[PDB]
Amino acid sequence: SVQIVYKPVDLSKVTSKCGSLGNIHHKPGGGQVEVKSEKLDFKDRVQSKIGSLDNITHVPGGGNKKIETHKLTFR
Amino acid sequence: SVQIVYKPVDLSKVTSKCGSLGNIHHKPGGGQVEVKSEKLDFKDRVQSKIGSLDNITHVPGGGNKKIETHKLTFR
Amino acid sequence: SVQIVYKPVDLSKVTSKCGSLGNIHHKPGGGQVEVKSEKLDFKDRVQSKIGSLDNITHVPGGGNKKIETHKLTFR
Amino acid sequence: SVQIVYKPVDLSKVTSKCGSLGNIHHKPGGGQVEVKSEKLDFKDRVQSKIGSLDNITHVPGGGNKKIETHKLTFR
Amino acid sequence: SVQIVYKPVDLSKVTSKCGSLGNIHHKPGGGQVEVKSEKLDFKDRVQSKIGSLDNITHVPGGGNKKIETHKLTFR
Amino acid sequence: SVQIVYKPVDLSKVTSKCGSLGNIHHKPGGGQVEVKSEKLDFKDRVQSKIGSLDNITHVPGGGNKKIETHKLTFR
């Protein structure tokens, strides 16, 4: 007789206190950009990105993360 | 007779206190950028990124992380 | 008769106190960039990144990390 | 013949640049205050101030000051 | 014949540049205060100040000051 | 014939550059204060200040000062 008891207890705390969060300045691509292209031959696929792209300002008040995985495999 | 008892107890704390968080300046790509391209032959795929791209300012009040994995495998 | 008792107890603390966090300046790529390319032959795949890319300013109030793995394997 | 010419020229500049101003915490009188007074005789004027009074948080973006006095006295 | 020419020229500059100003903590009077007064006789004026009073947090972005006095006295 | 020419020229500069100004902690009067007064006779004026008073946190981005006095006295 196989008897399995899976009783994990979790009283965890993931906490953050922040007095003030601010005055954040993200200024990407203030510089001049000049692309002068002449007599260019392309045989296959071309991907071009010019300028200021995919810039992120991520400012969460908390941004606390808890990942918990529970796995009971029986064969 | 196989008898398995899986009772892990977790009273953990992941904590942060911050008096003040601020005055953050991220200024990427203030410089001038000049790309002068002439008589260039391309046979295969081309990927070009010019300027200020994928710059991140990440400012979480906490940013505390708890990863917990539980695995009970029985064969 | 096989009898397994798995009762780990965790009363751990991962803590940080910070009086003030700030005045952070990240200024990448203030310099001028000039790429002059002439008479270049490419047979295979080309990847080009020019300028200020993938620069990170990561400022968490805490940034405390707890990784806990529990594994009970029975064969 | 008295001939007075009063032509002062003022091309002055009083300037300030501030990237960010913030995260200012003024917490006066966090402590407990207990005044136990017994059998006190007062013949003249009494002024009593108890607690947290006249506390100032003054945070100007500039706060630049120019005082200019011009005085031409003739007797 | 009295001939007075008063032509002062002022091309002065009073300037300040500040990248970031912040994370200022003023915490006066965190301590406990206990005043136990018994059998006190006062004949004249009494002024009493108890606790946390007249505390200043002054944080100007500039706070630049120019005082200029011009005085032409003729007798 | 009295002939006075007062032509002072001022091309002065009072300048300050500051990369970052911050993380300033002023904590006066964290200590306990106990005043136990018994059988005190006062004939004249009394001034009493108990606790945390007149504490200053002065943080100017510049705080540059130019004083200029011009005086032409004629008798």
Side-chain angles (χ1 to χ4, degrees):
Chain A
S1 69
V2 180
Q3 194 255 34
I4 299 153
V5 178
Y6 190 97
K7 289 197 292 176
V9 181
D10 187 294
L11 263 68
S12 77
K13 291 178 191 177
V14 187
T15 301
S16 66
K17 280 166 186 280
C18 203
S20 68
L21 211 187
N23 295 255
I24 319 291
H25 305 257
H26 192 208
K27 175 180 165 184
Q32 196 166 340
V33 177
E34 161 63 297
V35 184
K36 190 175 180 180
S37 298
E38 189 214 341
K39 298 173 174 180
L40 319 177
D41 300 342
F42 303 87
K43 299 295 164 185
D44 211 337
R45 292 161 177 265
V46 177
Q47 290 179 331
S48 173
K49 288 183 176 168
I50 306 167
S52 288
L53 291 97
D54 323 291
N55 300 288
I56 297 155
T57 303
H58 186 224
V59 191
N64 303 296
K65 197 180 185 200
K66 164 156 171 140
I67 307 104
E68 183 155 43
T69 300
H70 290 268
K71 191 178 184 178
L72 170 46
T73 298
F74 182 104
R75 285 179 183 173
Chain B
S1 69
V2 180
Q3 194 255 34
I4 299 153
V5 178
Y6 190 97
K7 289 197 292 176
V9 181
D10 187 294
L11 263 68
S12 77
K13 291 178 191 177
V14 187
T15 301
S16 66
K17 280 166 186 280
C18 203
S20 68
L21 211 187
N23 295 255
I24 319 291
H25 305 257
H26 192 208
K27 175 180 165 184
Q32 196 166 340
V33 177
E34 161 63 297
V35 184
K36 190 175 180 180
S37 298
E38 189 214 341
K39 298 173 174 180
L40 319 177
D41 301 342
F42 303 87
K43 299 295 164 185
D44 211 338
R45 292 161 177 265
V46 177
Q47 290 179 331
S48 173
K49 288 183 176 168
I50 306 167
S52 288
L53 291 97
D54 323 291
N55 300 288
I56 297 155
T57 303
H58 186 224
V59 191
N64 303 296
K65 198 180 185 200
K66 164 156 171 140
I67 307 104
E68 183 155 43
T69 300
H70 290 268
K71 191 178 184 178
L72 170 46
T73 298
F74 182 104
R75 285 179 183 173
Chain C
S1 69
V2 180
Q3 194 255 34
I4 299 153
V5 178
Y6 190 97
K7 289 197 292 177
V9 181
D10 187 294
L11 263 68
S12 77
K13 291 178 191 177
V14 187
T15 301
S16 66
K17 280 166 186 280
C18 203
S20 68
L21 211 187
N23 295 255
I24 320 291
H25 305 257
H26 192 208
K27 175 180 165 184
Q32 196 166 340
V33 177
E34 161 63 297
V35 184
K36 190 175 180 180
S37 298
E38 189 214 341
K39 298 173 174 180
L40 319 177
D41 300 342
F42 303 87
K43 299 295 165 185
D44 211 337
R45 292 161 177 265
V46 177
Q47 290 179 331
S48 173
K49 288 183 176 168
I50 306 167
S52 288
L53 291 97
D54 323 291
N55 300 288
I56 297 155
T57 303
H58 186 224
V59 191
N64 303 296
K65 198 180 185 200
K66 164 156 170 140
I67 307 104
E68 183 155 43
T69 300
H70 290 268
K71 191 178 184 178
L72 170 46
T73 298
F74 182 104
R75 285 179 183 173
Chain D
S1 69
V2 180
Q3 194 255 34
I4 299 153
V5 178
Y6 190 97
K7 289 197 292 176
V9 181
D10 187 294
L11 263 68
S12 77
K13 291 178 191 177
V14 187
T15 301
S16 66
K17 280 166 186 280
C18 203
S20 68
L21 211 187
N23 295 255
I24 320 291
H25 305 257
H26 192 208
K27 175 180 165 184
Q32 195 166 340
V33 177
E34 161 63 297
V35 184
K36 190 175 180 180
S37 298
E38 189 214 341
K39 298 173 174 180
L40 319 177
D41 301 342
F42 303 87
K43 299 295 164 185
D44 211 338
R45 292 161 177 265
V46 177
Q47 290 179 331
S48 173
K49 288 183 176 167
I50 306 167
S52 288
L53 291 97
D54 323 291
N55 300 288
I56 297 155
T57 303
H58 186 224
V59 191
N64 303 296
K65 198 180 185 200
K66 164 156 171 140
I67 307 104
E68 183 155 43
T69 300
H70 290 268
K71 191 178 184 178
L72 170 46
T73 298
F74 182 104
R75 285 179 183 173
Chain E
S1 69
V2 180
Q3 194 255 34
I4 299 153
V5 178
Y6 190 97
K7 289 197 292 176
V9 181
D10 187 294
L11 263 68
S12 77
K13 291 178 191 177
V14 187
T15 301
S16 66
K17 281 166 186 280
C18 203
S20 68
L21 211 187
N23 295 255
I24 319 291
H25 305 257
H26 192 208
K27 175 180 165 184
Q32 195 166 340
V33 177
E34 161 63 297
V35 184
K36 190 175 180 180
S37 298
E38 189 214 341
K39 298 173 174 180
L40 319 177
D41 300 342
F42 303 87
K43 299 295 164 185
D44 211 338
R45 292 161 177 265
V46 177
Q47 290 179 331
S48 173
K49 288 183 176 167
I50 306 167
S52 288
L53 291 97
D54 323 291
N55 300 288
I56 297 155
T57 303
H58 186 224
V59 191
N64 303 296
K65 198 180 185 200
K66 164 156 171 140
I67 307 104
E68 184 155 43
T69 300
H70 290 268
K71 191 178 184 178
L72 170 46
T73 298
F74 182 104
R75 285 179 183 173
Chain F
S1 69
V2 180
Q3 194 255 34
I4 299 153
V5 178
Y6 190 97
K7 289 197 292 176
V9 181
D10 187 294
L11 263 68
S12 77
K13 291 178 191 177
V14 187
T15 301
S16 66
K17 280 166 186 280
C18 203
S20 68
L21 211 187
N23 295 255
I24 319 291
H25 305 257
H26 192 208
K27 175 180 165 184
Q32 196 166 340
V33 177
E34 161 63 297
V35 184
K36 190 175 180 180
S37 298
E38 189 214 341
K39 298 173 174 180
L40 319 177
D41 301 342
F42 303 87
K43 299 295 164 185
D44 211 338
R45 292 161 177 265
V46 177
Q47 290 179 331
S48 173
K49 288 183 176 167
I50 306 167
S52 288
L53 291 97
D54 323 291
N55 300 288
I56 297 155
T57 303
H58 186 224
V59 191
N64 303 296
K65 197 180 185 200
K66 164 156 171 140
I67 307 104
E68 184 155 43
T69 300
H70 290 268
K71 191 178 184 178
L72 170 46
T73 298
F74 182 104
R75 285 179 183 173

